[PDB]
Amino acid sequence: NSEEIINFNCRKLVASMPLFANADPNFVTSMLTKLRFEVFQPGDYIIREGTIGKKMYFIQHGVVSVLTKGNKETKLADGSYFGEICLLTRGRRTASVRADTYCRLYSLSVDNFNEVLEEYPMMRRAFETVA
């Protein structure tokens, strides 16, 4: 996995997720400082089906294609994100995603959230509910 530095004004990108929007600015900031910048090229896979899911990607730019087991394929572009199912399923994800064009993503992980969202008991109580 890549761990490059991130661009400015990524707060809104992270807060694009309803959960992270409900999360306090203090936690979002922490996510940003732990935010991993990953670059991907056409044909590259980001998440594969049957692998342990525990991360989410926000799309800075480019086009990706998400395919879910037994479900209609959906494509995403600049300003979108994926990994909702990845986080939802704590075990092996039943979906995959690959890049259709040159793209760049912002990566957050549950391991990071164990430092962010489990930073305060007040958010630990909620995190226990979060899948």
Show the domains of the chain with their CATH numbers: 1-131 (2.60.120.10)
Question: Is 83 marked as a binding-site residue?
Answer: yes
SS3 66: strand
Show the DSSP H helices in 37-120 as ranges.
Answer: 84-88, 110-116
Rounded CA separation 36/116 (Å): 14
Quick check: 4 and 36 in contact, CB under 8 A?
yes
In the numeric block, which tokens belong to residue 88? 């939802």
Tokens 């008991």 belong to 121
Say if residue 69 is exposed, middle or buried (CB neighbours under 10 Å; 0-12, 13-18, 19+): exposed
62 in Cβ contact with 103 (< 8 Å): yes
Pairing of strands 74-76, 55-61: unpaired
Task: Yes or no: say if 58 and 105 are a contact pair by the CB < 8 Å rule.
Answer: yes
Is the CB of residue 58 less than 8 Å from the CB of residue 38? no
Question: 102: Cβ–Cβ under 8 A, 6 or more apart, which residues?
Answer: 40, 41, 42, 62
- Residue that has been written with the tokens 């509910």 in this structure: 129
**70, 76, 80, 81: CA torsion to nearest 10:** 50
The token pair that represents 3 in the structure block: 């761990």
Residue 94 annotated as binding site: yes
- Answer yes or no: is 74 a known binding residue: no
115 is in an annotated binding site: no
Give the Cα separation of 107 and 86 in Å (integer).
12
Residue listed under structure tokens 């489990």: 118
Q: Using an 8 Å Cβ cutoff, are 73 and 59 in contact?
A: no
* Residues facing residue 66 across a β-bridge: 74, 97
**With b meaning 16 or more CB within 10 Å and e meaning fewer, what string describes 90-120?**
eeebbbbbbbeeebbbbbbbbebbeebbeee
Residue 42: CB atoms within 10 Å:
12
> Residue 50, annotated ligand binder?
no
